[PDB]
Write an enzyme that holds these catalytic residues in place. Structure first.
Site, short mmCIF file in Angstrom:
data_model
loop_
_atom_site.label_atom_id
_atom_site.label_comp_id
_atom_site.label_asym_id
_atom_site.label_seq_id
_atom_site.Cartn_x
_atom_site.Cartn_y
_atom_site.Cartn_z
CD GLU A 88 14.51 -6.58 51.83
OE1 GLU A 88 15.10 -7.21 50.94
OE2 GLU A 88 13.82 -5.51 51.71
C1 LIG Z 1 13.97 -4.75 50.58
O1 LIG Z 1 15.38 -4.75 50.33
C2 LIG Z 1 15.61 -4.62 48.92
C3 LIG Z 1 15.76 -3.20 48.39
O2 LIG Z 1 16.92 -2.57 48.95
C4 LIG Z 1 14.47 -5.36 48.34
O3 LIG Z 1 14.84 -6.54 48.16
C5 LIG Z 1 13.36 -5.43 49.36
F1 LIG Z 1 12.25 -4.70 48.88
#
Ligand SMILES: *[C@H]1O[C@H](CO)[C@@H](O)[C@@H]1F
Ligand SMILES: Nc1ncnc2[nH]cnc12
Ligand SMILES: Nc1ncnc2[nH]cnc12
Ligand SMILES: Nc1ncnc2[nH]cnc12
Ligand SMILES: Nc1ncnc2[nH]cnc12
Ligand SMILES: Nc1ncnc2[nH]cnc12
Ligand SMILES: Nc1ncnc2[nH]cnc12
Ligand SMILES: *[C@H]1O[C@H](CO)[C@@H](O)[C@@H]1F
Ligand SMILES: *[C@H]1O[C@H](CO)[C@@H](O)[C@@H]1F
Ligand SMILES: *[C@H]1O[C@H](CO)[C@@H](O)[C@@H]1F
Ligand SMILES: *[C@H]1O[C@H](CO)[C@@H](O)[C@@H]1F
Ligand SMILES: *[C@H]1O[C@H](CO)[C@@H](O)[C@@H]1F
Lengths: 165, 167, 165, 167, 167, 167
Positions: free
Chosen positions: B101
């Site tokens: 992310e």
């Molecule tokens: C994707 O990465 C994390 C879970 O590992 C959360 O922040 C999001 F949903």
């Protein structure tokens, strides 16, 4: 479909912090070197030298070295047409994870090559990696497929059989 | 500066598998709620998707491709809608979902605030280069957690990562 | 999750070439105007005037008008946080399709609101639209849901029940 | 159509090296403050990062890599946060910083308002093709500066550059 | 200009549902094969994905989410790998898949060649603005189809759409 | 590692308005032609589009919208096709076209080689922060011009800008 010239440009992402990891990286290079669909392979650990830096791995590094090295890693992603990640399922590498996320945001295909030394543990994987990756090639059982995979087309192969973290 | 209306749209990234992590996420929500520069906070674990076709859902089990697709997209949609990322980064048990992310957000040129936490403050301070250089602002989870309540999310001031060994 | 201020900024994509299409667009505006999660709604047909152009719809237009109008359509996509498309399944609109493809490449969520006057025909849809769209709301049966959908979060709802073209 | 709340978030790009340049920026802030469609205006020279390790910083001389990164990143964060760019473009002394910023924004598909200024209103009008074709809306600074107070930033209507010779 | 090795990587976009369309695609392949500026040509309908779990695949029927995900991704992967798009655009029976792909490629800033075809040359020449302005180069399928064999894909010369009514 | 075929595709950005500027471009083409890692070099001023409707075009005067679009698009197509940018950056007469192009490329995460040139090697060295931090590799034009013939464009090693005062 048949390429006049190899077009596959690989960004070989991988941790390089243990002996097993350094070994898997060594084998991947040899396997990819046999694939006729590859034009170039980029391995980030193959380095910038800051003249001012008087430096050890894991120690405090100059901001200039950080910027140059970080950019070198991003530049490899930009030049690449595909990502191949020697993914350690035992000791998660956030560097590789960041890079996978970066590549997918650029819409580039990503080949996940998971490795584990603990088959006992239930096969689990984070949702982002499981759904972000476009093709999965098992490193423990199908490592050799890297030498034959068609990187000119990078055919998809969704992750399956893995429980979501 | 001087926003007419709050413009901060936070993507609150975080692992949510242990008690310690869940506690951090809960506290982060409280702190962010007190920040007048925030318009919205998206926490991926709040509302989930339900696949009517998915028989007996096992959290940690296989799971249908429909649920996977929908959930994965919800997590990307939060990034798309967000103006800034705020990650409750576990330095003891690295979360690759979180890292994916952060990389995704930086590829989109969005600022990212890293709020690292550790249950072992005495251990070596080391960070992966991608995270140390990718992140635009760092706010220590262990000692500066409270700053999330006053940080200006309308402008997201940079604060480069420093003091961490790099490997 | 609860918004301090509405953040949903909609790009209401739609054909505007028939009476039915103009009608669906009119209703969508009213429905979205009732949704408390919306800050702004952008409808491309609400225009630039080229002083030099001496002009009729469907006729040859000046390059300046083309550029200005095309950019106006892209600018709406840039400003928007979400796309809502009144998709005519009977008379395919390539303008809307281009726009959906454009939005997804920007990683923005897309709500497909399909309309059809020929329920007889087997429910079919192109793969790109079926897999590209993030949320589907049936225009013939669930049109009114636009007034309540949470555009602050834009929850996913994968296309199902449609055969792939 | 009509916005429920102001949604325009401006990246006010501008050189800040001469008295005339800083005077225009000052005026630009005033005009935008009067615009009902604006939620926030970001001006790169407003805040600024301070590097604790930077001993006796000289504005114009060598700056630390940490300050360079933080400052450059603040400049990009404003672009990421913004919905539209407004550039006080000095037609007499070209500013590469502004030009870089215009190109960056366009690569991101964000609209860009060019507000050209010249101390010689009578001289030949010429503009680089990249600037002339890259910008989505032009508002002459010498004669239409005031329009910034009424321009609809919720929708940002185009208005192609015309009347300038292309080189 | 003057490429050491061919650098053209073509994403050959096209509908493939009727005999006329399939014939065009076959001919396009032949013509592109004769172009010395091309390194690779990707045609989405060449190799498909097979879901071992998908019982009796019905072309036009429901189809598994796994097959959908894989196939959709194959079509995006071709765009990602490609340096240029070449669309055999059916002007009689508009293909939204093709249109989605053109929009996707333009959002990535990649050049797009439109090769429009019609079985009714006498009918009104009209094109949707998004296609007329989005496309960077037009080569008539009905009269200039052969140009695909000599067009320089190392540089992809622009040729704006003209002569088409716009709605 | 070692490339099986040259993979570097260069976007040779450069002003082309003075004799000194055009002389550098000419030399740049020669040096790159000698580099084994280069597959193709694109120079924006090489080709050019001709508008049939454009009666008696004056280079420097008003150009038709069609020519402006085709030419601007050719300039962006080169950036899209390229893997790396090489800019013959005139430090004496700033070129906004080049600066726009540098910013555009960086927004796309593509590496950018800055090759600065000055007719006054002894004057104070100063560079705009956006240019100084945006570029990924610097090769001095006054003293290291020749390095373009050996630089590894298959991998494009960084080399941050240093030694320049930041404004
Ligand atoms: C994707 O990465 C994390 C879970 O590992 C959360 O922040 C999001 F949903
Ligand atoms: N290229 C690189 N990427 C990440 N960490 C590193 N440490 C040393 N070189 C590195
Ligand atoms: N929103 C989410 N993101 C990632 N993994 C999840 N597991 C359950 N909900 C999830
Ligand atoms: N905004 C618009 N988009 C597409 N076609 C149009 N025709 C007139 N206005 C238009
Ligand atoms: N924000 C900024 N951008 C460019 N140069 C600067 N010098 C000081 N602050 C600056
Ligand atoms: N490659 C493909 N792309 C889109 N639709 C398809 N249907 C079958 N194969 C397809
Ligand atoms: N390619 C080009 N870019 C900018 N200005 C130009 N003038 C002529 N050709 C040009
Ligand atoms: C960046 O991430 C990893 C190391 O953690 C490498 O693949 C690349 F250099
Ligand atoms: C561009 O595409 C359609 C018209 O075909 C509209 O949604 C938008 F203006
Ligand atoms: C970056 O470029 C200019 C100054 O050169 C500013 O707009 C912004 F800070
Ligand atoms: C996606 O669009 C078309 C089919 O409609 C193909 O070109 C590609 F697979
Ligand atoms: C666009 O900018 C410069 C000239 O101003 C060239 O590099 C390119 F054509």
């Amino acid at each position: 479909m048949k390429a006049v010239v190899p077009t596959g440009k690989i960004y070989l992402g991988s941790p390089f912090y243990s002996d097993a990891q350094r070994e898997r990286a060594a084998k991947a290079k040899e396997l990819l070197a046999k694939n006729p669909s590859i034009a170039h392979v980029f391995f980030p650990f193959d380095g910038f030298t800051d003249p001012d830096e008087k430096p050890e791995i894991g120690g405090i590094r100059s901001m200039v070295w950080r910027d140059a090295t970080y950019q070198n890693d991003l530049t490899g992603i930009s030049n690449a047409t595909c990502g191949v990640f020697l993914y350690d399922m035992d000791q998660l590498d956030d560097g590789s994870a960041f890079e996978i996320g970066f590549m997918r945001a650029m819409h580039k295909p990503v080949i996940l090559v998971p490795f584990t030394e603990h088959p006992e543990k239930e096969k689990k994987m984070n949702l982002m990696i499981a759904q972000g990756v476009t093709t999965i090639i098992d490193g423990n059982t199908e490592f050799e497929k890297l030498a034959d995979y068609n990187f000119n087309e990078c055919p998809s192969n969704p992750v399956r059989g893995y429980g979501i973290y």
